Design a protein around this ligand. Structure first.
Ligand SMILES: CCCCCCCCCCCC(=O)OC[C@H](COP(=O)(O)OCC[N+](C)(C)C)OC(=O)CCCCCCCCCCC
Ligand SMILES: CCCCCCCCCCCC(=O)OC[C@H](COP(=O)(O)OCC[N+](C)(C)C)OC(=O)CCCCCCCCCCC
Ligand SMILES: CCCCCCCCCCCC(=O)OC[C@H](COP(=O)(O)OCC[N+](C)(C)C)OC(=O)CCCCCCCCCCC
Ligand SMILES: CCCCCCCCCCCC(=O)OC[C@H](COP(=O)(O)OCC[N+](C)(C)C)OC(=O)CCCCCCCCCCC
Ligand SMILES: CCCCCCCCCCCC(=O)OC[C@H](COP(=O)(O)OCC[N+](C)(C)C)OC(=O)CCCCCCCCCCC
Ligand SMILES: CCCCCCCCCCCC(=O)OC[C@H](COP(=O)(O)OCC[N+](C)(C)C)OC(=O)CCCCCCCCCCC
Ligand SMILES: CCCCCCCCCCCC(=O)OC[C@H](COP(=O)(O)OCC[N+](C)(C)C)OC(=O)CCCCCCCCCCC
Ligand SMILES: CCCCCCCCCCCC(=O)OC[C@H](COP(=O)(O)OCC[N+](C)(C)C)OC(=O)CCCCCCCCCCC
Ligand SMILES: CCCCCCCCCCCC(=O)OC[C@H](COP(=O)(O)OCC[N+](C)(C)C)OC(=O)CCCCCCCCCCC
Ligand SMILES: CCCCCCCCCCCC(=O)OC[C@H](COP(=O)(O)OCC[N+](C)(C)C)OC(=O)CCCCCCCCCCC
Ligand SMILES: [Cl-]
Ligand SMILES: [Cl-]
Ligand SMILES: [Cl-]
Ligand SMILES: [Cl-]
Ligand SMILES: [Cl-]
Ligand SMILES: [Cl-]
Ligand SMILES: [Cl-]
Ligand code: NA
Ligand code: NA
Ligand code: NA
Ligand code: NA
Ligand code: NA
Ligand code: NA
Lengths: 311, 311, 311, 311, 311
């Protein structure tokens, strides 16, 4: 067929709704997630109108090839959604109600600055291109926007799913394009990061500081170098569950900062020993005693500064 | 076509059955599993009735496009199942018997609290949306629910596969939706975790405690720090075969707890040495002797407490 | 169409054959393998019979939608095979000869008890469901069962591919089902496991035993703990190329057993040192001398016992 | 149908445009990236011309099977693009305007010489094969070449997307082929490599040099060998995020160079000790003092030389 | 339709050609590679002949469903190729020229004996099954065999792509099958293996030998055991980029051999110490001095022997 023609000179309003059935596979590195959802569309096609009293039925079904249907697409998807059309109902006045269930893999960038205490706003951008015959524009039927109460996005809490109601209308390749921004707001379940990464990483650091209550260089080197190695493991573990950002992450900072602490601890340990060998154990012992306070205090100050800067 | 019309204002009952042919790929991290199964549907379409004596045959075949078939979907799947229709039989009174074989990848959340001694209840949710003309409702033909005796779910024992017989009927976007809960109950084969992870992890810990029968700081540091490193490896190995939970897992607890034991062992070892150097080997030696009992005893108490809390 | 009706009261025999063109991707963890093969089917459809003199050709081609073809399926596949039909020939008497080339990923469980000296029997189960009108039964044309001379399963030797000729006929959901068992018998190329895993693992163990010719506790601890760590690496490497079994594997046993040897070596080393410090180097030295023989002898006995128990 | 015939004897010009909607998945190892884009085509088909005054409309839609459309393909793709046709408009003079949205995975080699400070030029090669009846040739409508302002290629900055306007026309299998080069110019966000890899790698190296202020062989060996091990980890980490090049990468050089520094540090440490044992601590001490300056100075010179050679 | 019938009693010659557009993804472990290529076919169908002077055109196009086309298949592919048909031209005498572009994933075994200095011969086997009506045979049009000059197979140099011109004709399931062997000859770019694996592995080994200029058992144990651990890492790294072969690889040998050197170095170090403790430092010192020459000399001899045996 081809598009409904205008009563006057008005653009065709296509009403939209997304209802999320499943969110899954939030891939931090790819910056993607998968969705399974109802997509609902509604518009006026005069051509399809009818009399309820004459026709005997108050609604009419159609198969999708029978009528004109707007080419709605997702902007930020990897490949075109799989969609199974569920239902098409036309009411007497020629109002069409379309309903598909779809699944798609969606590109949407993530801000890792506060990882792993971060929150994100995922987007699904619906779009339509205007044809020559007629301009098409999108709108949001809020009654058809939602998510079910089970949706679980393993590793994240889901706050809200709402749509920015006013589309962005713009020219692309000499046609009008109308674009809606659906927004899925989430925040990361940070709990497990504490016992699995953060505390272990501290424990190894604090073990490194036992060298400040020790006069054995051979022990000290072993303490500080072994723990430094373990820290690297955690650095590596962490930098692998995350992509290459052009900014420091919060955890990144702490991790990096900690290298400085290991480095300086090695210097102290080196200096202590060097002085003992020159028979200045008195001076050595002042530095060691200072280190016992300076290290943990500066560590604490530094973290407060960092948390201040990142939150 | 379109749905069979009601004698009077009664909903259409669609009878369901799932018969599992294969379960496989229980992915702990994605919280998914794959299934290969018969799906059976049955319903009354009066329009399709016939006389056996007149028509000459007592059952009639059809191809799926020929008749009306309800749009049954799975709720908790990644993408719509692949289904090949096997057989459609209509009996004289217009009773339709549908049978497909399908495969699907199913989202179903797992409770890791008692891992790896955990059991799970997987769900497959069948659903149908009511049309305008007619309300549809699902029911369970218990004679068509089962699994074959071979279904092996590598890494798990299968207890039962049963369906909750009373559907959950609810409004979604101003239509009735009817949802059945099929339940596959499993429990994890925990055996291999003992030799591969648990005992090794203990053995390294117990080796760390040999420092309590030693006066060599250089040895002790090496004992405790090396074993601590090995423990980290196991922590890492374990946290990678599992997803990020917002709750402690049982194994998680033990693993985390064990870091405290390493930490305190380092303190003891540090203290012992420090006293020897101040010529108080007598006090050192009391602490070392106490540690020999305190460590294993507190370890045992702590584990009893944990197992109590988790089981 | 629908199935050929019987001359008398006999079930329809569908003759089968599988000819393997490629085996590949034996995935130990998933317990799957991939196959690329001819599937050959043959049956009598009288309805399709014809005169060579009238029709002008001596055999007739068809496209699969044109005629009735039995719904033959694989039982133990992940998803339905990709099949490209190669040829359908119907001979004058209505004898159909079907030939597809297919590929599928096949579930078939593996017994890891003697890994990596294990052999396996893979299965491909062909099946057909009987319709209402007619009972269908499968049989094996032995002349159409085989494999290519160059079919290779990287990491395995292929012994035989044969079919159990007598189907298993049984009721499922009130219809007859007929099931054939094709069997691919293989055995693992164990060679590479010797230089890459087994010997290294021994070498590190034997290095640990050099502590029996040493009086340096600091050295000994380092010897035994470092090698123990290397052993863990191999344990981890091995447990990752394999799934979680509810039984001990042979290699698993050895690996696990070896932890006990490391543990006891640490005890010996600890004891030796403790006695030296109490000025009983004489007793220490007896234990050390005994250990030099006891360890390797008990190791040998233990392995003989294990190999006996597993083979 | 088949191609438009020429007014005279001129080749058929097909005008092209690519508008990038999404770039993603730049896989360094595979040397690929994924794209989602509009492809626009335009050409003259006289046969389709019409009178605006007679026909009543000034533009005509068609479905793709209705008219002749050139077989445009991508050269450097893994498999043929998924394309959904968006719009086909024909203007009175028989000028066709084609528009598809496509997605494809594109092979395009990367030069790793300056990694991770590298820039790249990705290519998308459009191509068309001439038929017997007519020569077909491609051209670039610059007004239909662009990318939207959001395109984000996680880990990279995007400079430009432009097309080389003059096609390369050449014989392949005795027909003319016409090929356009679209060019996406990018440069790597190198920031994260500094804190995650580069600085750590230096810090461990500088720690190794503390052995130059130490007289303990047992400590020194531990310092230098442990840090060497950590360096290997980083070598391994790095060589895994990259493919096997037949040329040195910049980072590769530094990494490799650093092994020489560890090697020589071990020699120094070995020599120092050997002399102390022969009661020549005076000579030892000159070498150690020299090493304190020589190592960092030569390290600096060497890096300047390398950066000069690579930039 | 069905096949062209013979003028006399001759088999139908189908002329073939493969022109490689892209080679990629040479996966060493799977022993596969991916290809993107033109497949060209040519044969005589008398039925399609025509008069150029009468018909007015010297060539005729067809769509593939219109005419008979031989079922050419690849033998050694995972799944049937994706193919888009490009062009079908028929010349007056009924000579058909077919051209598709395809992509496929190809199984072809690799000989790892000389890795990573190995060369390989990849195969693509084209095949055709004869029908009842007619025998089909394949041949190679050498003018349609080639690859473009860009084909880059990341990690490999490409020597040649040629076809063995004489097919192998043989019986399979009582029909003739005709099989062509296309051969892609490649050799591995070994350069990067030197700096990334081989030299590091030597450097660690040579560091182990510094224990021959040292009298400290505690140092020596640390030197030799730490380096042994690093060697294991490289063994593991290497055995993971490769499959399980039933033969020694060259690199495998060296790696394995090197374990023996570490083992014996531990024995030497153990012996040296044991003698020092029994106050025989004189004998110890002879063995240590011998080791300084024996180790590197035997290492060199052994490698010469191995390279001789493998090349
Ligand atoms: C007592 C003076 C100590 C001064 C502190 C040194 C900090 C080094 C700054 C690095 C900046 C990047 C190039 C790094 C070499 C390692 C430093 C070893 C210190 C030796 C101590 C000798 C005791 C007298
Ligand atoms: C190493 C040092 C430890 C790391 C410190 C935690 C960082 C933090 O404080 O994280 C902050 C988060 C969430 O913050 P928000 O909701 O985004 O705040 C918005 C603030 N505005 C509106 C002002 C911008 O709260 C937490 O879950 C705290 C739990 C911390 C447990 C730490 C374990 C030890
Ligand atoms: C008698 C000593 C009691 C030791 C208690 C140690 C505090 C533990 C903090 C828990 C943090 C979670 C910040 C930690 C510093 C390292 C510990 C140094 C121990 C020195 C012993 C000296 C012997 C006289
Ligand atoms: C540190 C050491 C960790 C020990 C782990 C104990 C786990 C446990 O005790 O868990 C018990 C689970 C069975 O649990 P269930 O059948 O679900 O009972 C639930 C019913 N309630 C609610 C009434 C209790 O299985 C086992 O017996 C595993 C065998 C233990 C082997 C340990 C070897 C060392
Ligand atoms: C001479 C006494 C032999 C002692 C054997 C102890 C074995 C423990 C068995 C655990 C089973 C798995 C819980 C174990 C603590 C570490 C043991 C330290 C040995 C100290 C020797 C002192 C010599 C006088
Ligand atoms: C760690 C200790 C070393 C492990 C020793 C291998 C176990 C084994 O000896 O296993 C035996 C298998 C063969 O068994 P089968 O073919 O199943 O015969 C079953 C017949 N019965 C049931 C009558 C016994 O290996 C081999 O062909 C020999 C390989 C030896 C390599 C070892 C090098 C070191
Ligand atoms: C005082 C003499 C210094 C000589 C340095 C020798 C470096 C060897 C270069 C290999 C190049 C790749 C094959 C390498 C042998 C191990 C090195 C042993 C060093 C012993 C020092 C003893 C001090 C008297
Ligand atoms: C280990 C030693 C440290 C590594 C040094 C960085 C290499 C570099 O200096 O690289 C330079 C590239 C930019 O190159 P370009 O300007 O794009 O090329 C054109 C150059 N011509 C005109 C000369 C041909 O990146 C940078 O801005 C590097 C800034 C980060 C510093 C890293 C801190 C440590
Ligand atoms: C001078 C004595 C020569 C030693 C030769 C070593 C034979 C090892 C054979 C292993 C075969 C695989 C079973 C391995 C035990 C470790 C060997 C420890 C050597 C101790 C030296 C004592 C000095 C007098
Ligand atoms: C650790 C020990 C060093 C590794 C030895 C290198 C391999 C080799 O020596 O092998 C040689 C192969 C080439 O083989 P070919 O010429 O095709 O043989 C066919 C000849 N016939 C007919 C005699 C059989 O590699 C090379 O191009 C050499 C580059 C080596 C650099 C290594 C640096 C260290
Ligand atoms: Cl879409
Ligand atoms: Cl579904
Ligand atoms: Cl409700
Ligand atoms: Cl309703
Ligand atoms: Cl199947
Ligand atoms: Cl394409
Ligand atoms: Cl194929
Ligand atoms: Na339509
Ligand atoms: Na239907
Ligand atoms: Na040490
Ligand atoms: Na059929
Ligand atoms: Na067309
Ligand atoms: Na055809």
């Amino acid at each position: 067929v081809s598009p409904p023609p205008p009563i006057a000179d008005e653009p065709l309003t296509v009403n939209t709704g997304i209802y999320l059935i499943e969110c899954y596979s939030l891939d931090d590195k790819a910056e993607t997630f998968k969705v399974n959802a109802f997509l609902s569309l509604s518009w006026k096609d005069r051509r399809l109108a009818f009399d309820p009293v004459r026709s005997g039925v108050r609604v009419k079904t159609y198969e999708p090839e029978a009528i004109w249907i707007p080419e709605i697409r997702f902007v930020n998807v990897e490949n075109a959604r799989d969609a199974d059309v569920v239902d098409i109902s036309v009411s007497p006045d020629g109002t069409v109600q379309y309903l598909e269930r779809f699944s798609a893999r969606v590109l949407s960038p993530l801000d890792f600055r506060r990882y792993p205490f971060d929150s994100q706003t995922l987007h699904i951008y619906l779009i339509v291109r205007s044809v020559d015959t007629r301009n098409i524009v999108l709108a949001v039927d809020l009654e058809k926007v939602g998510k079910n109460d089970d949706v679980f996005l393993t590793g994240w809490d889901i706050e809200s799913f709402t749509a920015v109601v006013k589309p962005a209308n713009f020219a692309l390749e000499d046609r009008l394009e109308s674009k809606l921004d659906y927004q899925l707001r989430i925040s990361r379940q940070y709990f497990s990061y504490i016992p699995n990464i953060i505390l272990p990483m501290l424990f190894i650091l604090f073990i490194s500081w036992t060298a400040f209550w020790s006069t054995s260089y051979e022990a000290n080197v072993t303490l500080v170098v072994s723990t430094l190695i373990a820290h690297i493991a955690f650095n590596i573990l962490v930098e692998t569950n995350l992509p290459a950002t052009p900014y420091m992450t919060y955890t990144g900072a702490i991790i990096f900062m900690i290298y400085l602490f290991y480095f300086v601890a090695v210097i102290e340990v080196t200096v202590q020993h060097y002085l003992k060998v020159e028979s200045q154990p008195a001076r050595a012992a002042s530095i060691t005693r200072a280190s016992r306070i300076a290290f943990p205090v500066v560590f604490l100050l530094a973290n407060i500064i960092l948390a201040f800067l990142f939150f």
